[PDB]
């Protein structure tokens, strides 16, 4: 299907914090982020450890624990017909554009077990868990007026922030990677000139 492009900014600490809030409240009910730790999410998002424990750790886990959830994959697969996959790496499995289009493409389809279908992910087993925010979206997708807390722009920002946090979760080393890579490449360019000159000197 055709995806909607979203410009994800991994330096936006506020956007990633809002996305982490949305993930902890609306997504960790069924999805784990078990491959990342609350402590590292707090450190990378600029969230104080006490604030992270108070506001984003609902499972009773420690700050250094993986973002595990009570819903076991087997039970969830039985209940929903499909296991809610761990979302730590979903931004790498699907990409941020796919996630952005998917979380905004839920519409009402009574023939489906959960009364919804998805344009990006047809016959998906996800219930439309963000319906309170987006509102009632029906098929071209249109939101029924006065059915959600947020308008189209406000919901897009919410999904964008959530996808941004998912983008960070999949690749928590991206910012540190680009910083280190710049110096490694600078050194190698510096080393290349000496190696190139040394080769040129000898091959006379």
């Amino acid at each position: 299907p055709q995806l909607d492009h979203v410009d994800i900014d991994l330096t936006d600490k506020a956007a990633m914090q809002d996305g982490a809030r949305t993930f902890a409240n609306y997504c960790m009910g069924c999805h784990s982020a078990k491959f990342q730790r609350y402590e590292r999410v707090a450190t990378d998002l600029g969230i104080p450890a006490d604030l992270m424990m108070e506001k984003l750790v609902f499972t009773g886990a420690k700050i250094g624990d993986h973002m595990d959830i009570g819903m076991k994959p087997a039970d969830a697969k039985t209940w929903f017909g499909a296991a809610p996959p761990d979302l730590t790496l979903v931004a790498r499995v699907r990409g941020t554009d796919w996630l952005y289009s998917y979380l905004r493409s839920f519409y009402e389809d009574p023939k489906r077990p959960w009364g919804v279908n998805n344009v990006i992910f047809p016959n998906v087993g996800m219930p439309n868990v963000l319906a309170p925010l987006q509102g009632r979206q029906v098929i071209q997708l249109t939101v029924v007026p006065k059915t959600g807390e947020l308008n189209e722009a406000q919901f897009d920002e919410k999904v964008k922030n959530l996808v941004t946090f998912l983008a960070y979760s999949a690749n928590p080393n991206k910012l540190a990677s680009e910083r280190i890579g710049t110096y490694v490449l600078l050194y190698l360019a510096f080393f290349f000139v000496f190696a190139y000159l040394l080769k040129r000197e000898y091959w006379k």
Binding site: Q17, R21, N25, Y26, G46, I47, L51, K55
Partner: peptide, 16 residues
Amino acid sequence: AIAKRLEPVGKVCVQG
């Protein structure tokens, strides 16, 4: 700022 940004969605009314 961050505390408001991270406020849990679920609000609970409590006696007193």
